[PDB]
Homo-oligomer: A and B are copies of this chain.
Amino acid sequence: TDPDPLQDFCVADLDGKAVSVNGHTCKPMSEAGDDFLFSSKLTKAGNTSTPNGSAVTELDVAEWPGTNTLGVSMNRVDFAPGGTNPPHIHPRATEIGMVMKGELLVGILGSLDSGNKLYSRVVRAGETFVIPRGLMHFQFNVGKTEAYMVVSFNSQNPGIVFVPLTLFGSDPPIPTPVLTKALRVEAGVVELLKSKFAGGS
């Protein structure tokens, strides 16, 4: 897990020309003021008019510098009806989440030695779920209304590996012959899938 802190506070210095280290260097405490332990960035719903039909509003260290060294972060996710937060992985954290409104099918997948088991449940307001570090998982809005959840992590920067976008729309894309061997389908099918992720999101 994230390295433990070595003092009370260490607000991230996010200037483009700051020295680079594991994590972030910190502002002098003299320059921090009173408000660094607080945020209002998750107060508003994100724009769900995206190809996925969901929107992620992040509150990692890049958006909340006061989290630097403290071992935590939070995101909000909003969903249109029938929208998905697609199969994804956090390389550097466990996630713990609560549904705030609506009805979400939440799925969590075991690794190979767990027989790739899929656990899935419809989760409603006030109900919670846990995603062990590094495992593939997804959410799907099964209600007729807009849904939203707020999720927390045991890292200041968990990372997000979106599985469809990474497989089919990386920069540059994975070669077609690699994908035909891996996916057990013809080139035409692979090229169709790539055409859907060419725009970069």
Chain A residues packing against B (C-beta within 8 Å): 1-10, 13, 19-29, 34-35, 37-44, 51-53, 59, 62, 64, 66-67, 69-74, 82-84, 86-87, 89-92, 94-96, 98, 100, 105-119, 121, 123, 125-136, 138, 140, 150, 152, 154-157, 159-167, 169-175, 177-178, 181-185, 189, 192-193, 196-197
Contact = CB atoms under 8 A, between A and B. Distances in A.
Contacts of A44: 126
Contact of A19 (B25, B34, B109, B152): B25
Most buried by B among A98, A156, A162: A98
A161 B132 contact: no
A10 B130 CA distance: 13
Given A6-B155, A118-B174, A185-B193, 20 more contacts: A1-B71, A4-B133, A5-B92, A8-B113, A21-B25, A37-B119, A40-B127, A64-B128, A64-B130, A66-B130, A67-B130, A74-B96, A82-B181, A89-B89, A89-B161, A107-B174, A109-B170, A113-B160, A116-B166, A118-B171
